[PDB]
Design a protein around this nucleic acid. Structure first.
Lengths: 182, 192, 79, 126, 136, 64
RNA sequence: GUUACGGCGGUCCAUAGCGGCAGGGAAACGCCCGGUCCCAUCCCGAACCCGGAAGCUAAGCCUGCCAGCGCCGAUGAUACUACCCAUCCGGGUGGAAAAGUAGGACACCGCCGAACAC
């Protein structure tokens, strides 16, 4: 007994508009976002093993779920990197929590970037999966932006059952990502 | 293409084995095999002088009008079995042929070439794969190289054909490469 | 001015020991081997050193089971 | 001229099931006095067999499709329970008391486990 | 000079001189070739001598292919040493050459000069050999 | 989701402080990260969060 | 018995695979709706698990087509070889490859269940 904003919108308008654009036979062919992905590469694992915990805490406060700590399966010593050194955190988002996260991101933070002209239409890949990146976490009001001791940027990537970049960009437009309309 | 399919007396074999075959080669025959969609593999002995006359005359792929057991038959030479040193002909496969069939063939080019002075030719390939009719296989794909200059990669899809003959080797091939000609000082820096 | 080579390792007597057709009792050793060149089938067991042995008497059949050479044992006919 | 990209989860789930079922099957055996109890599940209904892997033959059978088993009203679990009852009766008619239990590439628990536990209760030795 | 840049095993048995050719019994890339008749081990220096013999006999332009490469070493061991005490070090590199095998292929227009050149390169080698045209 | 608890999850009302085009929806943002004023925008009452800036108050592709 | 059905298996396991084309959804195989209950994520009801049948055969799957990517593959000859003859060379009786060729092949078989029927 509840509905998020973007999901109600998705089931109302966007499916209709893509149908009226691309004319699929079955509606099962309709594109739909599955999951959302978050990652943070600490990179100074061999110099600060504590920024890892810092990033864990930030993403906790940001996404409302305890992250995963991705280990280094290979040992490349030109970076000090050794088998099992924690280099980064990672979180998966699916469902109502995902739609809420996109609502927050599109409505609070991305309208808080400094001189946001536009996210490119060219972060796609093969079929329409949008892989962008943030330099700082100085933007989410979710975050306690008084306590941060360093910039700890991140990298986001958005995956969809779309089959090509045209359908991907069209769907993400209907959903309200500020592309550079070109 | 008014071919005269050469005629040849062939007799079926009693004994099929290495000893018999060597005795045959020694006597002055050549064993041979016949098959195809005949689906009755026949084993023959031809006569080597006559066979060599036939080949030297009409190229290697050269239809035959055989005489087996008094009965006559029609065949094509699909494959030869040659010795390296002596350069005899040890054995010969023969594909039966009805008239009007499409069988794939592999013939030889002929570089009729007189070039510019600053020019040299390089024949990257001799053998090109073709489909044609039975009685209508060529002997020599004549390719002409005159008036041309340095690099002119004669592709395979550039040769002139008969009417009703098709190229089946890919048209990517360098049949010829017209190299910029060497220097007497370039001949010192090749293979050292 | 030395040949630093020269060493070697004494044998281990590996290979098949009971080929096709033969009569084998129980617990008898068909093959000694390092890896599972030959795998077990039916009424056959594996060891620690990837040796094989018989679990039921009978006679041999070196057949394959999905690309891998097996060893089996079949029932002798009682007299 | 629309065209897809790759694997659907239906294919994934299917081939993973077959993968782990033929993993498990290494240890399970078959015989006419100790057959294998295979289960084949779907979301809606369920099927089971008693198998002899010496000849790849079959001795019993049951499923939640038969109207007499649909005459249950209760949960999926209760359908499964009555199925276990029927297969116990049928197996012990055709002359099998002891069996093994192949979970067929599925996890134990829920409908599978309630089936098997009903069968253990109603007499089968496993 | 011809040598490999590295071999895995730098002390090999002597190659075999038993049997006839399987490949290289057919001229490939030129017009006028050389064909062996005997068994022999042909080294680096011989082939250098021969290609130079050919290039100093055509002298301008016309190409030369070498279908052989010395990829099998042999081991001399230092002088006046009693037998035993190991295996000597590689010093020169041979290619085995079975009868029927083709070594060289020329591409020069006139058969006169070409046949002569190949003959001058034959007289720099240990084997009886003969000259080949690409024809049957 | 699972024990080894995550942050807490409660609704939120993002009150548009730009032009009064507010938002309100379920979220994982709560005791964790919420503001006072439980203003019912709907049949129920749940926390509120002043929205210093947003879309309809941020000139961009979606805003002038 | 039977159809473009499902499931369990087998072949000394690609003659069975990959890719392209068309085509099917009665009961079933499915995908899908949602996390109330068992149960679960090194975070995520994504997976596993649970409760149902709004929707679609789009995909999976099954059916036919394409010998194209791969595979299979002979007869005969050759290499090699056992034995014997033979003053070096070479040869005779028997055995017999690899490659290549002709070709084959878009699998076959068994059991139970359904649906269908006398």
């Amino acid at each position: 007994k509840a509905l998020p904003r973007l999901k109600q919108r998705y089931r109302e308008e966007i499916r209709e508009a893509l149908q009226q654009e691309f004319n699929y036979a079955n509606v099962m062919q309709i594109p739909g976002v599955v999951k959302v992905v978050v990652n943070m590469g600490v990179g100074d694992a061999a110099r600060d093993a504590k920024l890892i915990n810092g990033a864990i805490n930030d993403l906790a406060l940001i996404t409302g779920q305890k992250p995963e700590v991705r280990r280094a399966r290979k040992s490349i010593a030109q970076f000090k990197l050794r088998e099992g050194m924690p280099i980064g955190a990672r979180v998966t988002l699916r469902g109502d929590r995902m739609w809420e996260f996109l609502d927050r991101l599109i409505s609070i933070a991305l309208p808080r970037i400094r001189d946001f002209r536009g996210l490119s239409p060219k972060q796609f890949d093969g079929t329409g999966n949008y892989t962008f990146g943030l330099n700082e976490q100085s933007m989410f009001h979710e975050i306690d932006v008084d306590s941060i001791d360093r910039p700890r940027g991140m990298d986001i990537t958005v995956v969809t059952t779309a089959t090509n970049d045209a359908e991907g960009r069209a769907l993400l437009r209907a959903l309200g990502f500020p592309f550079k309309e070109n | 293409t008014a071919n005269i399919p050469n005629k040849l007396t062939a007799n079926v074999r009693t004994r099929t084995g290495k000893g018999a075959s060597r005795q045959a080669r020694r006597d002055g025959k050549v064993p041979a095999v016949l098959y195809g969609h005949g689906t009755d593999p026949q084993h023959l002995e031809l006569n080597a002088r006559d066979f060599a006359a036939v080949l030297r005359s009409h190229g290697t792929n050269a239809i035959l009008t055989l005489d087996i057991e008094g009965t006559e038959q029609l065949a094509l030479t699909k494959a030869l079995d040659v010795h390296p040193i002596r350069r005899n002909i040890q054995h010969a496969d023969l594909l039966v042929v009805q008239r009007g069939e499409k069988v794939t063939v592999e013939v030889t080019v002929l570089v009729e070439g007189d070039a510019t002075p600053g020019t040299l030719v390089t024949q990257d390939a001799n053998t090109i794969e073709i489909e044609a009719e039975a009685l209508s296989i060529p002997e020599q794909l004549t390719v002409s190289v005159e008036g041309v200059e340095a690099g002119t990669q004669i592709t395979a899809g550039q040769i002139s054909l008969p009417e009703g003959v098709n190229l089946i080797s890919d048209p990517e091939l360098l049949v010829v490469n017209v190299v910029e000609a060497p220097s007497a000082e370039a001949l010192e820096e090749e293979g050292a | 001015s030395s040949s630093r080579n020269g060493r070697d390792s004494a044998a281990q007597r590996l290979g098949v020991k009971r080929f096709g057709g033969q009569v084998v009792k129980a617990g008898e050793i068909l093959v000694r081997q390092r890896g599972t060149h030959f795998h077990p089938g039916v009424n056959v067991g594996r060891g620690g050193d990837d040796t094989l042995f018989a679990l039921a008497p009978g006679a041999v059949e070196f057949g394959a089971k999905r690309g891998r050479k097996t060893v089996n044992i079949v029932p002798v006919a009682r007299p | 001229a629309h065209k897809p990209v790759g694997q659907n989860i239906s294919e994934v789930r299917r081939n993973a099931r077959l993968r782990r079922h033929a993993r498990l099957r290494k240890k399970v055996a078959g015989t006419a006095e100790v057959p294998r109890l295979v289960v084949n599940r779907s979301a809606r209904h369920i099927h089971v067999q008693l198998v002899n892997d010496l000849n790849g033959t079959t001795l019993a059978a049951a499923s939640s499709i038969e109207a007499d088993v649909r005459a249950i009203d209760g949960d999926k679990k209760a359908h499964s329970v009555r199925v276990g009852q029927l297969i116990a009766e049928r197996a012990k008619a055709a002359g099998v008391e002891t069996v093994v239990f192949d979970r067929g590439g599925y996890t134990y628990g829920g409908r599978i486990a309630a089936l098997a536990d009903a069968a253990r209760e109603a007499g089968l030795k496993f | 000079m011809l040598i490999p840049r590295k071999v895995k095993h730098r002390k090999q048995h002597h190659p075999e001189q038993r049997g006839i050719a399987s490949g290289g019994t057919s001229v490939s890339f030129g017009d006028y070739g050389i064909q062996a008749l005997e068994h022999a081990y042909i080294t680096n220096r011989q082939i250098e001598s021969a290609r130079i013999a050919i290039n100093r006999h055509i002298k301008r332009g016309g190409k030369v292919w070498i279908n052989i490469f010395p990829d099998r070493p042999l081991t001399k061991k230092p002088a006046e040493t009693r037998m035993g005490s190991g295996k000597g070090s590689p010093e020169w590199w041979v290619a085995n050459v079975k009868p029927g095998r083709v070594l060289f292929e020329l591409s020069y227009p006139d058969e006169k000069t070409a046949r002569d050149a190949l003959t001058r390169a034959i007289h720099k080698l240990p084997i009886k050999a003969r000259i080949v045209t690409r024809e049957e | 989701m699972k024990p080894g608890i995550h942050p807490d999850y409660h609704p939120v009302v993002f009150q548009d402080a730009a032009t009064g085009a507010q938002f309100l929806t379920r979220s994982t943002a709560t005791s964790t990260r919420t503001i006072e004023w439980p203003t019912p925008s709907g049949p129920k009452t749940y926390p509120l969060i002043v929205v210093d800036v947003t879309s309809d108050s941020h000139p961009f592709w979606t805003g002038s």
